[PDB]
Design a protein around this ligand. Structure first.
Ligand code: NOJ
Length: 556
């Protein structure tokens, strides 16, 4: 169970480091930056997908599971990376993307040819309605219908994501066997585990029932299908049980009850899952604009949600801890201050997360406080934006252009995908060429070089949080109790382990706040383990908190 004690660094490789100068981050670039990641202190790297792919969804549309996309390199580069990771005592986790393939995968190129093609049932084909329309009213996560018509065979195929991402038919045992072969191919070559892309979607309701009623709907049927956990238990039996591996499922649609199904060790499924419930607190529940209908940051909602996951998986299963990935904006821009208080704010969110029970995930650039971009809408790359613009602004007019732009400036996935900022030179030192997407305009002030030269950097704060997790067993194995539950500024909680107490107090606001210890804790003596402000005190019975002040103390 080394995965319980791990800290994971997530790499989005096309934006991490470009070794050959074409503006596209590559595998040799990752290799050159492994020493940086090890010095930070992560011991597991999760690579977003580098498999061959036409890049309709930047690698999450896979056309060959057993070869690299040309701009990342060759399998020989991938094998070298695996060796270089292991040489440094680290582990490498790959992205398993098996809810769907590219429509340019050989399986689909065969499948679509005819209803009697041997690969026809590798995907999900349905007749039109009598009037020619789609089999049902299901929507794609990237706007529009979940179905696309094939003129040649007169049937629609299903895609929860883009039209170039047809969903695999997991009802077909041959499909499941192909997936397990891919897993064994890579695990036999040293891959230490898998992050499983939208694993909550692999089981469908084969009736494809309409949602109740907007033309296209995404809801309860898009995840948690009737055979989901049967399939994952099979995957464990056939593959995962045969390897010393780590698994994290990207569990779309997960609540805390579903998380127990996924992560209870006695169920022999996965080690941990990503949920979206803490990421969902700033969208309206059921707007036609989905994620783009933004609500202000609500700390009470964050506290209640994260607390439900800490208590729900306190003594069974295991949590993941994240605020950032390649699908989320920079958290300090989204929910905090990314200007005069950027360093304090970045360290505050880091303290909230890393003081909890679970496996922390650091997204590339989070550890230096990277921020959202001011680039104009036409410089965004993500197909999600182009498609939502068409549906929400042009066709349905449920958002004005101005409000859509404002929402994309807060939540667009490309705020995670601008190049990693290594120094204040050209293109922040990401590339000698022309980057595939613009470098954030603030890179001269925010970059790895200045971070390593500044003892007060966010980077060294993250490095210390990781050191503390390795030093203080209470951080890995202590229980969890929310304090000051209804305080709208202060996120405070207590971990307990073998008579020790860990107190975490974080002001997640720009204004002065007040922490008062619960009365039974007022006479404890504390050693401050970390704070984003200087501390010289052993009593924490009341703390007058400055903007974004974070304190972590251990009882003595
Ligand atoms: O594969 C579809 C979808 N799954 C979730 C991934 O994190 C996201 O980047 C991708 O677009």
């Amino acid at each position: 169970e080394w995965w319980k004690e791990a800290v994971v660094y997530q790499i989005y490789p096309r934006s991490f480091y470009d070794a050959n100068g074409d503006g596209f981050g590559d595998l040799q670039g990752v290799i050159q930056k492994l020493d940086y990641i090890k010095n930070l202190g992560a011991d597991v790297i999760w690579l977003s997908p580098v498999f061959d792919s036409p890049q309709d969804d930047n690698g999450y549309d896979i056309s060959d599971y057993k070869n690299m996309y040309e701009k990342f390199g060759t399998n020989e580069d991938m094998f070298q990376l695996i060796d270089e990771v292991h040489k440094r005592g680290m582990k490498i986790v790959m992205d398993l993307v098996v809810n769907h393939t590219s429509d340019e995968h050989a399986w689909f190129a065969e499948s679509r040819k005819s209803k009697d093609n041997p690969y026809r049932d590798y995907y999900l084909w349905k007749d039109p309605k009598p009037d020619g329309s789609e089999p049902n009213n299901w929507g794609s996560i990237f706007s529009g219908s979940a179905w696309t018509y094939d003129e040649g065979t007169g049937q629609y195929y299903l895609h929860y994501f883009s039209k170039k991402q047809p969903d695999l038919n997991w009802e077909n045992e041959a499909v499941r066997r192909e997936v397990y072969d891919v897993m064994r191919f890579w695990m036999d070559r040293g891959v230490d585990g898998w992050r499983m892309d939208v694993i909550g979607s692999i089981s469908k309701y084969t009736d494809f029932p309409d949602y109740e009623t907007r033309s296209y709907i995404v809801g309860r049927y898009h995840s948690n299908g009737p055979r989901l956990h049967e399939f994952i238990q099979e995957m464990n039996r056939e593959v995962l049980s045969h390897y010393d591996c780590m698994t994290v499922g990207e569990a779309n649609g997960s609540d805390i009850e579903e998380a127990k199904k996924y992560t209870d060790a006695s169920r022999q499924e996965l080690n941990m899952i990503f949920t979206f419930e803490h990421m969902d607190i700033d969208k309206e529940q059921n707007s036609p604009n989905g994620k783009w209908q933004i609500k202000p940051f609500d700390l009470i909602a964050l506290k209640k949600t994260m607390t439900r996951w800490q208590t729900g998986l306190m003594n069974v299963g295991w949590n993941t801890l994240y605020f950032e990935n390649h699908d989320q904006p920079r958290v300090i821009s989204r929910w905090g201050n990314d200007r005069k208080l950027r360093k304090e704010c970045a360290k505050a969110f880091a303290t909230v997360l890393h003081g909890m029970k679970g496996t922390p995930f650091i997204y590339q650039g989070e550890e230096i406080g990277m921020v959202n971009s001011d680039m104009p809408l036409e410089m965004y790359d993500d197909l999600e934006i182009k498609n939502a613009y068409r549906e929400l602004v042009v066709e349905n007019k449920t958002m004005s252009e101005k409000e859509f732009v404002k929402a994309v400036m807060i939540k667009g996935r490309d705020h995670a995908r601008t190049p990693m900022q290594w120094d204040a030179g050209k293109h922040a030192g990401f590339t000698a060429g022309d980057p595939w997407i613009p470098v954030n305009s603030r890179y001269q002030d925010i970059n790895v070089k200045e971070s390593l030269e500044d003892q007060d950097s966010i980077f060294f704060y993250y490095q210390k949080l990781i050191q503390l997790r390795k030093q203080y067993k209470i951080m890995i194995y202590g229980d969890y109790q929310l304090l000051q539950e209804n305080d709208p500024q202060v996120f405070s909680y207590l971990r307990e382990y073998r008579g020790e107490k860990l107190l975490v107090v974080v002001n997640l606001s720009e204004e002065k706040a007040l922490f008062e210890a619960p009365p039974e804790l007022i006479h404890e003596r504390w050693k401050v383990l970390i704070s984003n402000y200087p501390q010289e005190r052993a009593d924490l019975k009341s703390i007058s908190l400055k903007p974004y002040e974070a304190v972590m103390g251990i009882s003595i």
